[PDB]
Ligand binder design. Structure first.
Ligand SMILES: OC[C@H]1O[C@@H]2O[C@H]3[C@H](O)[C@@H](O)[C@@H](O[C@H]4[C@H](O)[C@@H](O)[C@@H](O[C@H]5[C@H](O)[C@@H](O)[C@@H](O[C@H]6[C@H](O)[C@@H](O)[C@@H](O[C@H]7[C@H](O)[C@@H](O)[C@@H](O[C@H]8[C@H](O)[C@@H](O)[C@@H](O[C@H]9[C@H](O)[C@@H](O)[C@@H](O[C@H]1[C@H](O)[C@H]2O)O[C@@H]9CO)O[C@@H]8CO)O[C@@H]7CO)O[C@@H]6CO)O[C@@H]5CO)O[C@@H]4CO)O[C@@H]3CO
Length: 476
């Protein structure tokens, strides 16, 4: 009697490439590529477990552009430059970027503390601010190759900074190839999402927000987004086919977001399985074990992720010592294993790249001990998505209806409902009426709506500039 464990790491970045300049206005795709996007599947080179990944098509596009040397990244060019060439604006952005990340364990260099406490910074000190910002984002693989430069911690030279940059781009050039390798070797399944990570239930039917939050106020949806919803799925199938040579049969719905109508659309588009959140299941069915494989109207398979286990990794364990975290996690799986007489299916689903910067040493002690301990347990079998979908010694249930929602509280409040978020929607609506190209799809990305209506942060105006730029480009 086994416990079936399914990791599904979700990887996504909105499009940071401003369409009129062609400049990546924020370096987050670059930094999560050198840190997480190659390195998370690369664990499968050293650990005999199965791990699954979701890659949004918008993120693949950007990875492709950095790998080909075509991405113009404004923050990165400030890193690359000799400090005597830096503009005041670039020094300010570099300082600003440092203090935004200052308290994260991956930024714990004593030299950073010194530089931050300083007045003007000289050339040698600016070189250390440049290179320490680079090295802070170093992934598992290169933390070994560059071990001597990391321990240096100070007094970097331009030639060392450039050495680091070269190795970083070699990692990006390797990144799509390793997803294809782990997929081919049977070590994991790779899924994708609708192209630009939109909220499909809202695009299909904005009134679905009233299934959970009846008092919410939303704008006048005077145009249809239903065919755009199909295009996000269709175009995602094409990009996935280009990269992996098949149409995708698994998708991760952005924000775990599902509705009756979105489930039908995914079925119509050839998706045979997805996952969503335990809160959705609880809202939808009285009798709700998340350890079953569900079938929505016998049309499509649906797993409901284990919220607590997913939140332990994403919310709790950054604050723990790795050993104590791993023993806690294994203990919890053991109680699940002992809590049922059948073989449960346990889906651990979260973002694969955002929680590790808050762990000591980028979560590497945690994940290396987690994966090493998992591969030791005879009563745990980790599954690819393909295996979880076809596994026969698993218990099963049909579900006929779901209450539309997301994995944020089971509702849509974080993307629609207040004055500022609603304004983005009205802008989108008006613009959809005048749209002439696919940049309107870019503007339908969830991320724009998330950041709006709650600014208060360093760099959030960049997301607003991107959204409005895409909205403007869509009408030309
Ligand atoms: O759009 C850009 C980003 O896109 C991508 O993200 C999307 C995901 O892909 C998508 O799946 C989804 O994510 C959901 C997520 O998976 C769920 O976990 C949840 O989010 C919760 C989160 O995980 C929790 O941490 C918690 O957050 C609280 C936190 O606990 C608390 O400490 C505090 O946060 C402060 C931080 O501690 C501090 O770091 C800082 O935050 C800064 C940040 O440091 C800084 O770097 C910058 O963030 C960058 C980010 O680093 C970049 O990588 C890039 O992000 C993209 C992701 O990489 C994608 O995967 O751009 C960001 C913006 O520049 O700026 C931050 C500003 O604050 O200060 C923090 C201020 O809070 O508070 C929080 C809140 O309680 O709970 C979260 C839920 O509230 O739900 C997600 C949405 O459903 O959506 C992603 C966004 O679109």
């Amino acid at each position: 009697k086994k416990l079936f464990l399914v990791f599904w790491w979700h990887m996504h970045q909105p499009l940071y490439r401003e369409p009129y300049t062609g400049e990546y206005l924020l370096p987050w795709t670059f930094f999560h590529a050198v840190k997480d996007y190659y390195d998370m599947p690369a664990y499968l080179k050293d650990f005999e477990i199965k791990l699954n990944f979701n890659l949004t098509p918008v993120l693949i596009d950007q990875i492709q552009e950095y790998a080909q040397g075509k991405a113009k990244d404004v923050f990165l060019e400030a890193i690359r430059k000799d400090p005597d060439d830096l503009e005041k604006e670039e020094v300010e952005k570099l300082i600003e970027f440092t203090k935004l990340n200052y308290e994260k364990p991956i930024y714990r260099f004593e030299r950073i503390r010194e530089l931050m406490n300083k007045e003007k910074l000289n050339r040698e000190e600016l070189l250390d601010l440049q290179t320490l910002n680079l090295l802070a984002w170093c992934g598992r693989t290169l933390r070994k190759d560059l071990k001597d430069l990391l321990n240096k911690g100070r007094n970097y030279t331009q030639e060392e900074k450039e050495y680091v940059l070269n190795k970083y781009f070699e990692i990006i050039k390797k990144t799509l190839s390793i997803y294809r390798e782990i997929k081919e070797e049977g070590k994991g399944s790779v899924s994708t999402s609708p192209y630009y990570h939109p909220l499909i239930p809202i695009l299909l039917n904005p009134n679905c927000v009233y299934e959970t939050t009846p008092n919410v106020k939303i704008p006048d949806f005077a145009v249809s987004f239903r065919e755009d919803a199909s295009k996000h799925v269709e175009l995602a199938k094409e990009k996935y086919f280009e990269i992996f040579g098949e149409h995708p049969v698994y998708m991760w719905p952005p924000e775990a977001s599902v509705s009756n109508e979105a489930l039908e659309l995914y079925y119509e588009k050839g998706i045979n399985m997805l996952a969503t959140d335990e809160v959705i299941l609880k809202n939808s069915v009285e009798r709700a074990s998340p350890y079953l494989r569900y079938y929505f109207r016998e049309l499509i398979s649906v797993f409901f992720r284990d919220k607590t286990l997913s939140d332990l990794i994403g919310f709790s364990y950054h604050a723990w010592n790795a050993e104590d975290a791993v023993r806690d996690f294994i203990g919890r799986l053991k109680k699940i294993h002992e809590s049922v007489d059948f073989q449960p299916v346990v889906f651990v689903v979260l973002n694969g790249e955002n929680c590790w910067e808050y762990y000591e040493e980028n979560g590497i002690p945690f994940l290396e001990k987690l994966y090493s301990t998992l591969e030791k347990e005879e009563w745990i079998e980790t599954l690819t998505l393909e295996e979880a979908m076809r596994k026969e010694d698993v218990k099963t249930e049909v579900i006929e209806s779901v209450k539309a929602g997301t994995w944020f509280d089971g509702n849509f409040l974080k993307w629609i409902g207040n004055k500022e978020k609603n304004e983005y929607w009205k802008i989108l609506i008006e613009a959809k009426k005048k749209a002439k190209n696919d940049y309107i799809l870019v503007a339908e990305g969830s991320d724009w709506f998330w950041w709006q209506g709650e600014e208060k942060a360093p760099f959030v105006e960049v997301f607003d500039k991107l959204f409005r730029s895409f909205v403007r480009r869509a009408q030309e």
